[PDB]
Write a protein that binds this ligand. Structure first.
Ligand SMILES: C[C@](O)(COc1ccc(F)cc1)C(=O)Nc1ccc([N+](=O)[O-])c(C(F)(F)F)c1
Length: 238
């Protein structure tokens, strides 16, 4: 039942709308990454709200958890698409936004990109199954919380425990749980580097001709700094 649901709500293909017939430029690549990010967020929200037990969470906690986990969720799913679509040869942000090393360099996010390429390869090396991937991704949504707590922390703790239990069931074991939780933890540092980069970019966006969508700018200026300043932190297994 649980896996049937995860499979049923998994988002379909999302395109960036990037002009690939134009020579690569920092400004156009980032504007497409921003637009793609916002298009994906629409889907992440619909996906999250359809998750088993997600409605149990307080209304305000639902929005917060989605906004904080947004980057991580995208990173994890992008790594999977890279592995399944191009065997980690490139980063498959979208069918019309595929990064080769040249674009990784031109985007000024080279180190983060190489770490995501390594993540992509890990899916292959660890032989992650589509079902482990689905459960792990859902678990990522419940892996970052505020130090001062959510409106209903207890409901959040129960839900996270339940998702961990589902992972146990998919696995069923110890060595595998170790491998998967280590892989999950590796997502956070990458999301952090992307958050930092994105934060710095928005602050100087007017200096590099980068276009930030309304909702994204609000989230980067209101939520992301809570993560960067240590007020909101990820939950690591290790
Ligand atoms: C630069 C940026 O547009 C910033 O997007 C944000 C995403 C979340 C957030 F809280 C703040 C900004 C970005 O990283 N976009 C992006 C778009 C798509 C994907 N993707 O499809 O996986 C990613 C990725 F997760 F890879 F890094 C990143």
């Amino acid at each position: 039942i649980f896996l049937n649901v995860l499979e049923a709500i998994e988002p379909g293909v999302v395109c960036a709308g990037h002009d690939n017939n134009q020579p690569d430029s920092f400004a156009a690549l980032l504007s497409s990454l921003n637009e793609l990010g916002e298009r994906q967020l629409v889907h992440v929200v619909k996906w999250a709200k359809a998750l088993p037990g997600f409605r149990n969470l307080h209304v305000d906690d639902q929005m917060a958890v989605i906004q904080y986990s947004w980057m991580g969720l995208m990173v994890f799913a992008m790594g999977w698409r890279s592995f399944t679509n191009v065997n980690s040869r490139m980063l498959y942000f979208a069918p019309d936004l595929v990064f080769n090393e040249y674009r990784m360099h031109k985007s000024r996010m080279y180190s983060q990109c190489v770490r995501m390429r390594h993540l992509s390869q890990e899916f292959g090396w660890l032989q992650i199954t589509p079902q482990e991937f689905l459960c792990m991704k859902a678990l990522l949504l419940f892996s970052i919380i505020p130090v001062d707590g959510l409106k209903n922390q207890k409901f959040f703790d129960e839900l996270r425990m339940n998702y961990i239990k589902e992972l146990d069931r998919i696995i069923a074991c110890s060595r595998r749980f170790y491998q998967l939780t280590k892989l999950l933890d590796s997502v956070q540092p990458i999301a952090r580097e992307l958050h930092q980069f994105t934060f710095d970019l928005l602050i100087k966006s007017h200096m590099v001709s980068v276009d930030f969508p309304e909702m994204m700018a609000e989230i980067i200026s209101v939520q992301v700094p809570k993560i960067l300043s240590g007020k909101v932190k990820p939950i690591y297994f290790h």
